[PDB]
Design an enzyme around this catalytic site. Structure first.
Site, PDB file in Angstrom:
ATOM      1  N   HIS A  56     -24.034 -26.127 -31.987  1.00  0.00           N
ATOM      2  CA  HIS A  56     -22.973 -25.814 -33.077  1.00  0.00           C
ATOM      3  C   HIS A  56     -22.041 -27.327 -32.291  1.00  0.00           C
ATOM      4  O   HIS A  56     -21.190 -27.959 -33.394  1.00  0.00           O
ATOM      5  CB  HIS A  56     -21.910 -25.090 -33.396  1.00  0.00           C
ATOM      6  CG  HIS A  56     -21.362 -24.636 -32.076  1.00  0.00           C
ATOM      7  ND1 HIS A  56     -21.906 -24.002 -31.504  1.00  0.00           N
ATOM      8  CD2 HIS A  56     -19.503 -24.549 -32.521  1.00  0.00           C
ATOM      9  CE1 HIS A  56     -20.516 -24.500 -30.474  1.00  0.00           C
ATOM     10  NE2 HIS A  56     -19.306 -24.901 -30.909  1.00  0.00           N
TER      11      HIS A  56
ATOM     12  N   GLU B 219     -10.336 -29.540 -26.716  1.00  0.00           N
ATOM     13  CA  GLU B 219      -9.571 -28.120 -26.871  1.00  0.00           C
ATOM     14  C   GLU B 219      -8.745 -28.138 -25.176  1.00  0.00           C
ATOM     15  O   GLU B 219      -7.678 -27.309 -24.894  1.00  0.00           O
ATOM     16  CB  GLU B 219     -10.173 -27.554 -27.145  1.00  0.00           C
ATOM     17  CG  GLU B 219     -11.218 -27.091 -28.470  1.00  0.00           C
ATOM     18  CD  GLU B 219     -11.623 -25.876 -28.344  1.00  0.00           C
ATOM     19  OE1 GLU B 219     -13.193 -25.844 -29.163  1.00  0.00           O
ATOM     20  OE2 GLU B 219     -11.719 -25.151 -28.248  1.00  0.00           O
TER      21      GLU B 219
ATOM     22  N   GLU C  91     -16.730 -19.494 -22.001  1.00  0.00           N
ATOM     23  CA  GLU C  91     -17.566 -20.498 -22.541  1.00  0.00           C
ATOM     24  C   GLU C  91     -16.299 -21.062 -23.355  1.00  0.00           C
ATOM     25  O   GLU C  91     -15.527 -20.725 -23.448  1.00  0.00           O
ATOM     26  CB  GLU C  91     -18.412 -20.231 -23.831  1.00  0.00           C
ATOM     27  CG  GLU C  91     -19.046 -21.611 -24.959  1.00  0.00           C
ATOM     28  CD  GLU C  91     -18.316 -21.997 -25.845  1.00  0.00           C
ATOM     29  OE1 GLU C  91     -18.469 -21.751 -26.932  1.00  0.00           O
ATOM     30  OE2 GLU C  91     -17.597 -22.891 -25.133  1.00  0.00           O
TER      31      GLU C  91
ATOM     32  N   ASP D 284     -25.159 -19.865 -33.171  1.00  0.00           N
ATOM     33  CA  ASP D 284     -25.701 -21.581 -32.547  1.00  0.00           C
ATOM     34  C   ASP D 284     -26.493 -20.087 -31.478  1.00  0.00           C
ATOM     35  O   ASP D 284     -26.329 -19.485 -30.348  1.00  0.00           O
ATOM     36  CB  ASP D 284     -24.813 -22.537 -32.223  1.00  0.00           C
ATOM     37  CG  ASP D 284     -25.391 -22.969 -30.948  1.00  0.00           C
ATOM     38  OD1 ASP D 284     -25.820 -22.759 -30.638  1.00  0.00           O
ATOM     39  OD2 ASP D 284     -24.620 -23.823 -30.749  1.00  0.00           O
TER      40      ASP D 284
HETATM   41  C1  LIG Z   1     -14.869 -23.488 -26.627  1.00  0.00           C
HETATM   42  N1  LIG Z   1     -15.634 -23.218 -26.402  1.00  0.00           N
HETATM   43  C2  LIG Z   1     -15.773 -23.917 -28.231  1.00  0.00           C
HETATM   44  C3  LIG Z   1     -17.192 -23.470 -29.039  1.00  0.00           C
HETATM   45  N2  LIG Z   1     -16.970 -24.591 -30.411  1.00  0.00           N
HETATM   46  C4  LIG Z   1     -16.868 -25.507 -30.378  1.00  0.00           C
HETATM   47  C5  LIG Z   1     -15.991 -23.693 -31.234  1.00  0.00           C
HETATM   48  C6  LIG Z   1     -16.056 -24.051 -32.588  1.00  0.00           C
HETATM   49  C7  LIG Z   1     -16.840 -23.691 -33.850  1.00  0.00           C
HETATM   50  N3  LIG Z   1     -16.689 -24.033 -34.689  1.00  0.00           N
HETATM   51  N4  LIG Z   1     -15.351 -24.494 -34.667  1.00  0.00           N
HETATM   52  C8  LIG Z   1     -14.996 -24.902 -33.441  1.00  0.00           C
HETATM   53  C9  LIG Z   1     -14.074 -24.853 -32.854  1.00  0.00           C
HETATM   54  C10 LIG Z   1     -12.730 -24.373 -32.262  1.00  0.00           C
HETATM   55  C11 LIG Z   1     -11.281 -24.818 -31.394  1.00  0.00           C
HETATM   56  C12 LIG Z   1     -10.941 -26.169 -31.572  1.00  0.00           C
HETATM   57  O1  LIG Z   1     -10.390 -26.875 -31.020  1.00  0.00           O
HETATM   58  C13 LIG Z   1      -8.806 -27.001 -31.755  1.00  0.00           C
HETATM   59  C14 LIG Z   1      -8.129 -28.133 -30.648  1.00  0.00           C
HETATM   60  C15 LIG Z   1      -7.422 -28.258 -31.853  1.00  0.00           C
HETATM   61  O2  LIG Z   1      -6.562 -27.744 -32.166  1.00  0.00           O
HETATM   62  C16 LIG Z   1      -5.149 -27.745 -30.967  1.00  0.00           C
HETATM   63  C17 LIG Z   1      -4.193 -27.549 -31.378  1.00  0.00           C
HETATM   64  C18 LIG Z   1      -2.433 -27.317 -31.340  1.00  0.00           C
HETATM   65  C19 LIG Z   1      -1.501 -26.905 -32.328  1.00  0.00           C
HETATM   66  C20 LIG Z   1      -0.600 -27.790 -32.661  1.00  0.00           C
HETATM   67  O3  LIG Z   1       0.006 -28.602 -31.691  1.00  0.00           O
HETATM   68  C21 LIG Z   1      -0.987 -29.719 -30.703  1.00  0.00           C
HETATM   69  C22 LIG Z   1      -1.994 -28.212 -30.283  1.00  0.00           C
HETATM   70  C23 LIG Z   1      -8.510 -27.454 -32.985  1.00  0.00           C
HETATM   71  C24 LIG Z   1     -12.278 -27.111 -32.551  1.00  0.00           C
HETATM   72  C25 LIG Z   1     -14.004 -26.884 -32.884  1.00  0.00           C
HETATM   73  N1  LIG Z   2      -5.837 -20.156 -21.553  1.00  0.00           N
HETATM   74  C1  LIG Z   2      -6.494 -18.851 -22.514  1.00  0.00           C
HETATM   75  N2  LIG Z   2      -6.651 -17.554 -22.553  1.00  0.00           N
HETATM   76  C2  LIG Z   2      -7.009 -16.523 -22.962  1.00  0.00           C
HETATM   77  N3  LIG Z   2      -8.051 -17.234 -24.108  1.00  0.00           N
HETATM   78  C3  LIG Z   2      -8.519 -18.638 -24.290  1.00  0.00           C
HETATM   79  C4  LIG Z   2      -7.816 -19.466 -23.656  1.00  0.00           C
HETATM   80  N4  LIG Z   2      -7.632 -20.493 -23.701  1.00  0.00           N
HETATM   81  C5  LIG Z   2      -9.195 -20.027 -24.913  1.00  0.00           C
HETATM   82  N5  LIG Z   2      -8.955 -19.179 -25.456  1.00  0.00           N
HETATM   83  C6  LIG Z   2     -10.194 -18.463 -26.065  1.00  0.00           C
HETATM   84  O1  LIG Z   2     -11.929 -18.947 -25.769  1.00  0.00           O
HETATM   85  C7  LIG Z   2     -12.578 -18.733 -26.919  1.00  0.00           C
HETATM   86  C8  LIG Z   2     -13.717 -20.103 -26.779  1.00  0.00           C
HETATM   87  S1  LIG Z   2     -14.623 -19.833 -27.751  1.00  0.00           S
HETATM   88  C9  LIG Z   2     -15.584 -17.958 -26.821  1.00  0.00           C
HETATM   89  C10 LIG Z   2     -15.569 -16.972 -27.463  1.00  0.00           C
HETATM   90  C11 LIG Z   2     -16.514 -16.138 -26.782  1.00  0.00           C
HETATM   91  N6  LIG Z   2     -16.830 -16.110 -25.478  1.00  0.00           N
HETATM   92  C12 LIG Z   2     -17.780 -16.523 -27.692  1.00  0.00           C
HETATM   93  O2  LIG Z   2     -18.632 -16.641 -26.820  1.00  0.00           O
HETATM   94  O3  LIG Z   2     -18.852 -16.673 -28.395  1.00  0.00           O
HETATM   95  C13 LIG Z   2     -11.319 -19.115 -27.834  1.00  0.00           C
HETATM   96  O4  LIG Z   2     -11.439 -17.705 -28.687  1.00  0.00           O
HETATM   97  C14 LIG Z   2      -9.943 -18.508 -27.418  1.00  0.00           C
HETATM   98  O5  LIG Z   2      -9.044 -18.500 -28.546  1.00  0.00           O
END
Ligand SMILES: CNCCN(C)Cc1c[nH]nc1-c1ccc(O[C@H]2C[C@H](OCCC3CCOCC3)C2)cc1
Ligand SMILES: Nc1ncnc2c1ncn2[C@@H]1O[C@H](CSCC[C@H](N)C(=O)O)[C@@H](O)[C@H]1O
Ligand SMILES: CNCCN(C)Cc1c[nH]nc1-c1ccc(O[C@H]2C[C@H](OCCC3CCOCC3)C2)cc1
Ligand SMILES: Nc1ncnc2c1ncn2[C@@H]1O[C@H](CSCC[C@H](N)C(=O)O)[C@@H](O)[C@H]1O
Ligand SMILES: [Mg+2]
Lengths: 351, 337
Positions: free
Chosen positions: A293, A140, A131, A39
């Site tokens: 993205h 998240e 980020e 991205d």
């Molecule tokens: C902060 N910068 C995020 C930037 N992008 C959204 C990252 C990204 C690129 N592709 N896909 C993702 C992605 C990454 C994480 C994500 O979210 C996770 C939140 C969900 O689990 C939480 C589950 C826990 C464990 C089970 O109990 C509840 C909490 C999925 C969703 C998309």
């Molecule tokens: N409380 C916390 N402490 C440390 N890392 C964390 C966190 N909550 C989320 N993260 C991490 O934060 C990242 C968010 S995505 C961003 C990744 C990187 N800074 C980039 O710009 O490419 C993930 O790797 C996730 O595991």
């Protein structure tokens, strides 16, 4: 007594520890980081937003909250930061430490594993970069980790990158959805069997659910002027607690013309402070702007509604953590289209 | 837990998306349409069982080909939509939709023909074939027609260019962002290749590194085929590479064949990378990491397709393989969620 009170919190504390760990595990694999770094709009906005503040970062210390593969921390060192603490709770921290070493920056960037909430830094910092934005901004629920770090570790008057966020909503027409609904009425011409009677069923399946759908739109899909419904100034005191109560506001707009309305899209932007001479850099996820993205987050009505020029669309929207899972975005929507009665729909982010 | 696994399976087919995807698959759907039409002489005035009728489309093709009566048996809640489609086309006298598993349905009579689209990813994912054979044994008259009549499985070594671009992504980061991340190639490889999941992915003809090899033939009229599915479907393979390439693993795919009818024109529905795309794509079996091959590099092994122990509807692949004069290696796969 002290002990009894601690024992009473043990179960909820443990459950959160365990849910956090499964959240961090979503960042242990290569694909999410490939997607984030591919991205260019995202990644170059950070690169330039950081670079633009080089004069304020030169010789200073930075905390990268959620450093991932380490890329933003390396940008900060490249901007002249003396020391960067790259804090990362997911196992990807190992890859970040390798990237840092491979670029010869092991003296400038220190990768620290574990949650930023419990990390131990040697010092307060001059700046925080992160980020932290999820789909619909707040999916998240990472923002509270950034604010936690800010309150605990950022020096008075310190820099935040980005500094603020804004949320927007507009009524939309999803062309892909429209094609999927109309598919059944085209079966006769393709195959000689009339399946137009399944449009109702298709509609129930594709629009009647209560999931937030991440889908990319373009400018022509937007049926009225987008409306800002929230502004988050990250330095604002007590912003932490507001997140738990809900982020949102009311909206009203008027449609441009005739179109089948399928629901609403929400999106966000974040703003990096401008630096000395330099101008504030906006990272936008709008359908009017180059795709990211994050795409947009779509809130479908139960079925389409035809709108016309000057059809009035109003409502209220609130973004919340979901009931069973705090890291899952929930949207409470009230809306009114034209002369239809006001309606309510409660969404949760798709799996 | 057996009640519950079926319910989750049929829930999938309760929703519109899977049926949209199947019917938007023109290669699939026109192959059935033409395959059925082609056998009008075997179908005119006859009775048909459609095993897993879904929205009813194949049953209607059969009625359009002149079948006097079609029993459209469907275990998912989509049977309601099929009954509506049938009525909406004025065919309620010709097509009867019957809810429930074909294993326990009660038909008023044996049938002259069975039609079914039973094929999953890698042919046997979903494990529907045993339901078709169960229906055939119980309900198909002796000498009755089966559409399609047979299936074949194929394997070839591959170099997945799209995968290669994902692996090489990390070495291109420096050029655009000024950070060298080429050191993450190993990590990317472990994540994208080191897992043991079967990946459904469409390949180009250009991705095929040697002549594809048939490793199973399923003649659906054969009594005893039911029990073979339980032992595993497969066998050995051997082939020789066309040229230089980083081999990433193997692709498997299948075809099914509809008998030719009066016109004596058998219709083949293929899911080969050499033919137009279908929603089955191909099923990819990645090695743990790439291995370089050259022209005439010999590739041999054995493959077996089986149901998973813990979920019978989930495809499992046991692979043993030898590339060139590398040592023989082993990998077990299960279909991705
Ligand atoms: C902060 N910068 C995020 C930037 N992008 C959204 C990252 C990204 C690129 N592709 N896909 C993702 C992605 C990454 C994480 C994500 O979210 C996770 C939140 C969900 O689990 C939480 C589950 C826990 C464990 C089970 O109990 C509840 C909490 C999925 C969703 C998309
Ligand atoms: N409380 C916390 N402490 C440390 N890392 C964390 C966190 N909550 C989320 N993260 C991490 O934060 C990242 C968010 S995505 C961003 C990744 C990187 N800074 C980039 O710009 O490419 C993930 O790797 C996730 O595991
Ligand atoms: C017989 N003709 C099939 C032709 N097509 C493969 C149908 C199709 C089109 N799109 N998508 C599918 C599809 C349908 C089913 C499917 O797999 C089935 C097994 C899946 O859950 C069973 C149990 C669930 C999932 C696994 O974990 C436990 C719960 C559904 C995969 C693709
Ligand atoms: N044992 C069984 N008995 C009845 N139906 C079954 C079955 N196993 C699977 N099915 C159904 O078989 C269908 C397979 S998909 C094919 C659907 C339709 N015949 C078409 O070609 O478009 C699904 O709708 C599924 O619910
Ligand atoms: Mg590339």
């Amino acid at each position: 007594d002290g002990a009894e009170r601690e024992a009473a919190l043990e179960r909820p504390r443990r459950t959160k520890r365990e849910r956090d760990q499964l959240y961090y595990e979503c960042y242990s694999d290569v694909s999410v980081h490939e997607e984030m770094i591919a991205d260019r709009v995202r990644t170059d906005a950070y690169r330039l937003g950081i670079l633009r503040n080089w004069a304020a970062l030169r010789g200073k210390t930075v905390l990268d909250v959620g450093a991932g593969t380490g890329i933003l921390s390396i940008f900060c060192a490249q901007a002249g930061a003396r020391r960067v603490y790259a804090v990362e709770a997911s196992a990807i921290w190992q890859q970040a430490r390798e990237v840092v070493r491979f670029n010869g920056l092991e003296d400038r960037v220190h990768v620290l594993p574990g949650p930023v909430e419990t990390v131990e830094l040697p010092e307060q910092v001059d700046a925080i970069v992160s980020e932290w934005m999820g789909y619909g901004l707040l999916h998240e629920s990472m923002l509270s980790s950034v604010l936690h770090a800010r309150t605990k570790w950022l020096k008075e008057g310190g820099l935040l990158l980005p500094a603020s966020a804004e949320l927007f909503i507009a009524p939309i027409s999803d062309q892909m959805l429209e094609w999927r609904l109309g598919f059944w009425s085209q079966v006769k011409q393709h195959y000689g069997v009339d399946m137009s009677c399944l449009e109702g069923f298709a509609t129930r399946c594709l629009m009647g659910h209560s999931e937030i759908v991440v889908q990319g739109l373009s400018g022509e899909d937007v049926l009225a002027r987008p409306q800002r419904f929230a502004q988050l100034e990250l330095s604002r005191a007590g912003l932490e607690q507001e997140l738990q109560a809900g982020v949102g506001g009311r909206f009203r707009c008027s449609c441009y013309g005739s179109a089948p309305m399928h629901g609403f899209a929400i999106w966000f932007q974040v703003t990096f402070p401008g630096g000395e001479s330099e101008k504030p850099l906006v990272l936008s996820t709008s359908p009017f702007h180059p795709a990211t993205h994050w795409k947009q987050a779509l809130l479908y009505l139960n079925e389409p509604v035809q709108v016309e020029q000057d059809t009035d669309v109003s409502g209220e929207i609130t973004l919340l953590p979901s009931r069973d899972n705090p890291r899952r975005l929930r949207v409470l929507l009230r809306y009114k289209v034209g002369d239809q009665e006001e309606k309510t729909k409660d969404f949760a982010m798709e799996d």
